[PDB]
Amino acid sequence: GRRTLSQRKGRGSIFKSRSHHKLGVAQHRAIDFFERHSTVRGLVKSIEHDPGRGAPLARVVFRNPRQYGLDKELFICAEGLYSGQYIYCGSKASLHIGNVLPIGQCPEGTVVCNVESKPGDRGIIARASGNYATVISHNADNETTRIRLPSGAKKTLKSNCRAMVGIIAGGGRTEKPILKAGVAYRMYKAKRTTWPRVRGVAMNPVDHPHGGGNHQHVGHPTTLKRSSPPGQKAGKVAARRTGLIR
Amino acid sequence: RTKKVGIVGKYGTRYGASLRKVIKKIEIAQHSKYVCPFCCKEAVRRTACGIWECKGCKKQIAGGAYTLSTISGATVRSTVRRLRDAKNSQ
Amino acid sequence: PKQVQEFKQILKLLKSGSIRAVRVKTNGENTKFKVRCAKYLYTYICADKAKAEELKKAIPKDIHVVEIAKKAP
Amino acid sequence: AVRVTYVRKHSYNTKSNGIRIVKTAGGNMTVQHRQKISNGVRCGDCGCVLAGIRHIRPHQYGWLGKSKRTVTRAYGGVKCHKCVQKKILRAFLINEHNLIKL
Amino acid sequence: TGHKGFSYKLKLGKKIHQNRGVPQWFRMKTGNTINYNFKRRHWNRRKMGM
Amino acid sequence: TKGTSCRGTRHNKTHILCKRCGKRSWHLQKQRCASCGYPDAKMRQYAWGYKALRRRTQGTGRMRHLKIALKR
Amino acid sequence: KQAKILGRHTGHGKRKGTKNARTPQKTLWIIRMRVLRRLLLKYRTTGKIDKHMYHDFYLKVKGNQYKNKKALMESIFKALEEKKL
RNA sequence: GAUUCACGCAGUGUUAACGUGCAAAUUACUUGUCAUAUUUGAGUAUAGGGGCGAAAGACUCAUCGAACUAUCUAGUAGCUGG
RNA sequence: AAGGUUCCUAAACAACAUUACUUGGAUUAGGGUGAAUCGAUCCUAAAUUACAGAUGGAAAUCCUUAAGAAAAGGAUUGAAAGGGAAUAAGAUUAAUAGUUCUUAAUCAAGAGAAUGGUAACAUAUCAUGAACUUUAAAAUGGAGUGUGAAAAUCUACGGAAGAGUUCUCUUUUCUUCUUAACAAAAGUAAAUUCCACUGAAAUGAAUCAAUCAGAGAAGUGGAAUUUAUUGGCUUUGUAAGAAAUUCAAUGAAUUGUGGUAUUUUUGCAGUCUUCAUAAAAAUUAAAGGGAACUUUUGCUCGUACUAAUAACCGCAACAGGUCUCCAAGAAGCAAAAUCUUUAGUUAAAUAGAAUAACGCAGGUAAGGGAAGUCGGCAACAUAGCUCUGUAAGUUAGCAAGAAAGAGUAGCUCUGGUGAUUAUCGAAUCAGAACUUUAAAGGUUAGGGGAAUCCGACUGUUUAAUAAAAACAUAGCAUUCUGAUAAAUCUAAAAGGUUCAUUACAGAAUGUGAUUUCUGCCCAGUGCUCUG
Incomplete structure (x- = not known):
């Protein structure tokens, strides 16, 4: 047999990300006293376009409070942020658009984007373009708050997690129909190498498990167990229900 | 010069009736000057996917990928505004 | 190469001790006193033949003076 | 109509290998290495080019006279005159505002 | 080539120095069977591969 | 065009002369010699290449300072 | 070239190129306005x-109403008389 | 990711030429294509039940439905020749 | 890049270049490669590799700044096409010359607490400026239009010198009339961005296109920057003493001024396009802050030659393959085909004779016109441009160069399209007489129509018998995953890829544009369950 395309994608020979023109890691600033127990002031110097994502990155320039000099940062742009803005990122910050707040201060129903998953990891949840997570409730007994992730699942987080208020910019990106092959090929300029995707049933029996015979077809159910060996795990993995939803 | 296929007449005859009508709505918005919230002018012109630069008075406003402010991104501005004021007073 | 513009500097320059050698070219109409200093080569284009004679007497005897004509040396 | 040849070992028309053809004594035409085109300075707030400073190479600024690479003004050389007129009013009107606030 | 490193030029120089025939006086010795150089080569016959 | 036609673009050398063995066996991209096992400290000797041992081993060279010690 | 000035050879069977190729339509209008808008100024x-x-x-002039310079000075001459009434 | 001419490139047809050739795959005419899913140089990455593949079991130094080289190896053969 | 002495000269021809050679990239012997300014050297890119650490029976593997008492913040290598301190003209050699000689420059490292303008901003180094911090340059996609400048070509006026034709004429046809690096400021431009006075409506200003204005248009006066070195063009030093063209036998003569012409090169201005936004460091300058003219040296390495129908790779002097720079005339829309000028060559696996068959390559033909054949295979025919006209179908965009018809030569004329106040300049369109051999056709140069099947389209593939109806593709749809996860590489691992990521996302799949529609079936085999 052979090693199918999903088995060669794990080594990373030609499938590494084309992250050469990328601006940098977009995240909050490191946790400290001036943010835990006070507020800082950040200036949104300019909005930039980090290649390989549909959400613009804003270049916020703080001041070093402990030392002398600037503390340049890189924030994902919430919608509505403009050049020359003043955004305050602290625990006592005011509930405006772009002001980073601990998730435990936002009133129920507040919109928070770029929420942390654990206090101090600087942004995990709701980072893509046009997405946001909505606070649900609070629980002062154990200092945990419920939010609704953009997938609809609801997760419980500590109240110290930071979460910039608002929705992420560049929303409604996918509503435009890519019309051609070229436009879809240029979309993967700053991503991995996976665009022209050849069907399993249009393959010889070695390359893919779906390699058909004298008629182009599958032959065995595509719904597989989760505990299949890598290489035979094709089609739909652990499918609870297949077919069009009626 | 053309009865109904206004901007998508550059695609000729080779993408389908529905898709060329769907993309007509988006390419129109993508290439129009919006009223600039600060300088108060029809000068905001898109530069990248989600970065609108007011050419009138030199500001870079973020927004939707094809419109200056998405519908779901304007209620959140009002939703936060409603939640902020009530929180202040009781 | 640089050019001096009037009599004030050319007379002052020759009296200075930095001068290495002096060349004079006699064209059909004018004459250039291409003095050669340590660094550059300064030349004054004189059209009045009388004003050249007083320039022809200002060169110190301690340097080489070459008078050129329609034939190169 | 004289056909010339590159005088350096560079044989490819790269950015650093631009040449200009000039005439020469006797009708000969020779090759000269012309330098690249560079950008001027930009204000640190608005990103607009500054006046009074030439657009030359980074090292060529060293050979310029000390007054040929600045502009004689507060923040002269790093911020435009509009970029500085606004700095003064901010640094003054703000001080008056919080003088009476507290 | 036009641009050769120093340790590469001196090895070419030895490969032209070794591409010489037997000296005339050597072949006139007694019991001297070394009449021709069989380690020779040329630029158009055998590329020395180096 | 797998024969004569495609043999025209062969001018990018792969193996250059090595420094410890002197053969044209230094792979430029792999940065190691295929015949004498460069930067690897040990000389590369394999038992299946019994001929490749007698082509270069002890005794095949000048023996500048070893022909003396054994004589003594 | 001397004969071509008098139109000796510029016939219909001595043209191998399109009407727009020999006389570009853009450069006949770029020059047309520069002739007109200079007179207006x-x-x-x-x-x-x-x-x-x-x-x-x-x-x-921008809307292609006046075909040449002569047909513009006539219209200026016309519209000046209606001014004094 | 419109129609075409050219520099180039390919290889649709003649199932033309040659078929102990110019050529271990080339030549001529005809045909297509000739800048955005374009052509190309150098450096770097991916190596044998592995790699790479707009998918033909194709490409991996004139070798691929499992490369080249060496050791087991003078492998075994109820089969052919001496 | 590759080759390595093939480069130049002399002698020589046994061998080799499918005959021969006095020739040779072949035999022998000598000669030749000159750098402070060109490159390497220096910096970083995709990437690569060390000490300590972790993993491993073992070989060794992983991490590259994280695990470290290591390196102010992080080590090595990585580009002769990326970044980069500084050089040109003439001449010389049998060959080397941005490398030598003459002349003329440039760079680096040394050595010997100021004024002016209202303002934009400006002063042959000047006019102090440490720690720390910031800004900027180095530093960046593409398409199309307009324009400034230079060079080439063409051309107007006036010439100087030489060459060609001349029994038939031609004040005729041709050649030469040039100038560098680096610097200076007589004169004089185009574009853009700013400043001062005033404040626009009866709205104006302007471009080929746009675009702009009471957070301030137009007007007047200024400032800065770009335009192949200073300062863009002419001009000047360099510099005529060089060089080119002539004359005399070393010595003599000349080197004005234009163009509303075509192309190339290099900049500028705005416009358009991206679900593409189109590198880093060395190195340099300024700001915030206020701590305290001369002369010397410039080391190492490459430099010859071919760069190909004979110097490279193909067993070779192989019709194959191999990345670039410079670019004249005629003609045309065209860097097309065809002919010529500067340059290269007449030899590149041997020739003479005769003019049989059968051939390869190129042609033509009476009358008929696919009856030949598996099949219009092969061949023939239409072809440029202008005007008139152009169906069914259709996703309303297309079909369309649909189909069809008329014109096209030569000579002599006329008119239209502009700048300056009558002169001057451009190829372009239209029209009228007269003549003939009745005119795109030397070369270049669409055959057309009516139907059916498949694929939606541009695109890709079996190098060497399959170029498509296959593969891809945008569209439709399905499944899992909250990130310590899903997929998944490794024997192992504070190990690796998507992930510099976070559900508008990652991974695994089937069908293949648009329109219309996806019916009944959960028994069987899979998958799933909160039973």
Whole structure:
């Protein structure tokens, strides 16, 4: 047999990300006293376009409070942020658009984007373009708050997690129909190498498990167990229900 | 010069009736000057996917990928505004 | 190469001790006193033949003076 | 109509290998290495080019006279005159505002 | 080539120095069977591969 | 065009002369010699290449300072 | 070339190229306005016409109403007489 | 990711030429294509039940439905020749 | 890049270049490669590799700044096409010359607490400026239009010198009339961005296109920057003493001024396009802050030659393959085909004779016109441009160069399209007489129509018998995953890829544009369950 395309994608020979023109890691600033127990002031110097994502990155320039000099940062742009803005990122910050707040201060129903998953990891949840997570409730007994992730699942987080208020910019990106092959090929300029995707049933029996015979077809159910060996795990993995939803 | 296929007449005859009508709505918005919230002018012109630069008075406003402010991104501005004021007073 | 513009500097320059050698070219109409200093080569284009004679007497005897004509040396 | 040849070992028309053809004594035409085109300075707030400073190479600024690479003004050389007129009013009107606030 | 490193030029120089025939006086010795150089080569016959 | 036609673009050398063995066996991209096992400290000797041992081993060279010690 | 000046050879069977190729349609109109808009500025600077009249003639020229320079000075001459009534 | 001419490139047809050739795959005419899913140089990455593949079991130094080289190896053969 | 002495000269021809050679990239012997300014050297890119650490029976593997008492913040290598301190003209050699000689420059490292303008901003180094911090340059996609400048070509006026034709004429046809690096400021431009006075409506200003204005248009006066070195063009030093063209036998003569012409090169201005936004460091300058003219040296390495129908790779002097720079005339829309000028060559696996068959390559033909054949295979025919006209179908965009018809030569004329106040300049369009051999056709140069099947389209593939109806593709749809996860590489691992990521996302799949529609079936085999 052979090693199918999903088995060669794990080594990373030609499938590494084309992250050469990328601006940098977009995240909050490191946790400290001036943010835990006070507020800082950040200036949104300019909005930039980090290649390989549909959400613009804003270049916020703080001041070093402990030392002398600037503390340049890189924030994902919430919608509505403009050049020359003043955004305050602290625990006592005011509930405006772009002001980073601990998730435990936002009133129920507040919109928070770029929420942390654990206090101090600087942004995990709701980072893509046009997405946001909505606070649900609070629980002062154990200092945990419920939010609704953009997938609809609801997760419980500590109240110290930071979460910039608002929705992420560049929303409604996918509503435009890519019309051609070229436009879809240029979309993967700053991503991995996976665009022209050849069907399993249009393959010889070695390359893919779906390699058909004298008629182009599958032959065995595509719904597989989760505990299949890598290489035979094709089609739909652990499918609870297949077919069009009626 | 053309009865109904206004901007998508550059695609000729080779993408389908529905898709060329769907993309007509988006390419129109993508290439129009919006009223600039600060300088108060029809000068905001898109530069990248989600970065609108007011050419009138030199500001870079973020927004939707094809419109200056998405519908779901304007209620959140009002939703936060409603939640902020009530929180202040009781 | 640089050019001096009037009599004030050319007379002052020759009296200075930095001068290495002096060349004079006699064209059909004018004459250039291409003095050669340590660094550059300064030349004054004189059209009045009388004003050249007083320039022809200002060169110190301690340097080489070459008078050129329609034939190169 | 004289056909010339590159005088350096560079044989490819790269950015650093631009040449200009000039005439020469006797009708000969020779090759000269012309330098690249560079950008001027930009204000640190608005990103607009500054006046009074030439657009030359980074090292060529060293050979310029000390007054040929600045502009004689507060923040002269790093911020435009509009970029500085606004700095003064901010640094003054703000001080008056919080003088009476507290 | 036009641009050769120093340790590469001196090895070419030895490969032209070794591409010489037997000296005339050597072949006139007694019991001297070394009449021709069989380690020779040329630029158009055998590329020395180096 | 797998024969004569495609043999025209062969001018990018792969193996250059090595420094410890002197053969044209230094792979430029792999940065190691295929015949004498460069930067690897040990000389590369394999038992299946019994001929490749007698082509270069002890005794095949000048023996500048070893022909003396054994004589003594 | 001397004979071609008198139109000796510029026939219909001695053309192998399109009408737009020999006489570009863009450069016959780039020059047409530069001929006209220079006259409009010349009269306004001279003082024959005013800014309000020169404005309604700037757009009229821009809309391809006057075919040549002669057919514009006639219209200026015409519209000046209606002014004094 | 419109129609075409050219520099180039390919290889649709003649199932033309040659078929102990110019050529271990080339030549001529005809045909297509000739800048955005474009052509190309150098450096770097991916190596044998592995790699790479707009998918033909194709390409991996004139070798691929499992490369080249060496050791087991003078492998075994109820089969052919001496 | 590759080759390595093939480069130049002399002698020589046994061998080799499918005959021969006095020739040779072949035999022998000598000669030749000159750098402070060109490159390497220096910096970083995709990437690569060390000490300590972790993993491993073992070989060794992983991490590259994280695990470290290591390196102010992080080590090595990585580009002769990326970044980069500084050089040109003439001449010389049998060959080397941005490398030598003459002349003329440039760079680096040394050595010997100021004024002016209202303002934009400006002063042959000047006019102090440490720690720390910031800004900027180095530093960046593409398409199309307009324009400034230079060079080439063409051309107007006036010439100087030489060459060609001349029994038939031609004040005729041709050649030469040039100038560098680096610097200076007589004169004089185009574009863009700013400043001061005033404050626009009867709205104006302007471009080929746009675009702009009471957070301030137009007007007048200024400032700065770009335009192949200073300062863009002419001009000047360099510099005529060089060089080119002539004359005399070393010595003599000349080197004005234009163009509203075509192309190339290099900049500028705005416009358009991206679900593409189109590198880093060395190195340099300024700001915030206020701590305290001369002369010397410039080391190492490459430099010859071919760069190909004979110097490279193909067993070779192989019709194959191999990345670039410079670019004249005629003619045309065209860097097309065809002919010529500067340059290269007449030899590149041997020739003479005769003019049989059968051939390869190129042609033509009476009358008929696919009856030949598996099949219009092969061949023939239409072809440029202008005007008139152009169906069914259709996703309303297309079909369309649909189909069809008329014109096209030569000579002599006329008119239209502009700048300056009558002169001057451009190829372009239209029209009228007269003549003939009745005119795109030397070369270049669409055959057309009516139907059916498949694929939606541009695109890709079996190098060497399959170029498509296959593969891809945008569209439709399905499944899992909250990130310590899903997929998934490794024997192992504070190990690796998507992930510099976070559900508008990652991974695994089937069908293949648009329109219309996806019916009944959960028994069987899979998958799933909160039973």
